[PDB]
Amino acid sequence: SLSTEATAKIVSEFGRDANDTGSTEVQVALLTAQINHLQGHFAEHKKDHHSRRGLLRMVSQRRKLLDYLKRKDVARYTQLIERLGLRR
RNA sequence: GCGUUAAGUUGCAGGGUAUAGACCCGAAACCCGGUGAUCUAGCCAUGGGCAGGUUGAAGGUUGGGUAACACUAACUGGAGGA
Numbered sequence: 001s002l003s004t005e006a007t008a009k010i011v012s013e014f015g016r017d018a019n020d021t022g023s024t025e026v027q028v029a030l031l032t033a034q035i036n037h038l039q040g041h042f043a044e045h046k047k048d049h050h051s052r053r054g055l056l057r058m059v060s061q062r063r064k065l066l067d068y069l070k071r072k073d074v075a076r077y078t079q080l081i082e083r084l085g086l087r088r
Numbered sequence: 089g090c091g092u093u094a095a096g097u098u099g100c101a102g103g104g105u106a107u108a109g110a111c112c113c114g115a116a117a118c119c120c121g122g123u124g125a126u127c128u129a130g131c132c133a134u135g136g137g138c139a140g141g142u143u144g145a146a147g148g149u150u151g152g153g154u155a156a157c158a159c160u161a162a163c164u165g166g167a168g169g170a
């Protein structure tokens with residue numbers, strides 16, 4: 001759902017440089033962007049169960065990445081959820 | 089068979105009959121034209137009344153909760169031919 005420009009913008013804002021697409025912060029920010037963007041799709045299409053399975057995978061993938069970041073560097077974790085607006 | 093050989097008629101009094109309320113009193117009812125919604129039934133307009141004490145619906149806020157909902161606890165709130 002995310003376009004190329006929007007994706008590239010996130011990589012630059014959370015990565016080390018322009019092609020640090022793999023860092024945990026970038027991945028979590030990318031997932032957060034798609035999850036938030038898809039809230040408008042599922043408000044209109046409540047019965048799109050097949051797409052929602054893909055969304056719930058993003059949610060669980062983000063939870064696992066966050067639990068890993070919190071276990072490695074708590075400081076990086078705290079900054080990340082604050083910038084993104086996540087409860088935990 | 090009915091008649092012919094038996095005086096009627098007009099007053100007055102009386103007996104009966106007829107039409108009339110027709111010896112007197114008495115229905116329940118039927119019809120016609122009026123008077124009544126100051127009681128009461130319903131409605132319409134415009135005003136008033138309901139001591140005191142209870143119960144605690146929806147909603148709201150805050151926290152928990154969720155990807156977001158849902159959900160949940162407290163506080164608040166003051167529903168009802170209660």
Ligand SMILES: [K+]
Nearest residue numbers: 095096097098
């Ligand atoms: K005579």
Ligand SMILES: [K+]
Nearest residue numbers: 105108110111
């Ligand atoms: K008589």
Ligand SMILES: [K+]
Nearest residue numbers: 138140141142
């Ligand atoms: K009362």
Ligand SMILES: [K+]
Nearest residue numbers: 146147164165
């Ligand atoms: K309540």
Ligand SMILES: [K+]
Nearest residue numbers: 143144166167
């Ligand atoms: K009450």
Ligand SMILES: [Mg+2]
Nearest residue numbers: 001031034058
């Ligand atoms: Mg993907």
Ligand SMILES: [Mg+2]
Nearest residue numbers: 099100101102
């Ligand atoms: Mg006479």
Ligand SMILES: [Mg+2]
Nearest residue numbers: 117118119120
């Ligand atoms: Mg008659």
Ligand SMILES: [Mg+2]
Nearest residue numbers: 116117118119
């Ligand atoms: Mg009759």
Ligand SMILES: [Mg+2]
Nearest residue numbers: 123124125126
């Ligand atoms: Mg009258």
Ligand SMILES: [Mg+2]
Nearest residue numbers: 125126127128
């Ligand atoms: Mg009256």
Ligand SMILES: [Mg+2]
Nearest residue numbers: 143168169170
């Ligand atoms: Mg009552």
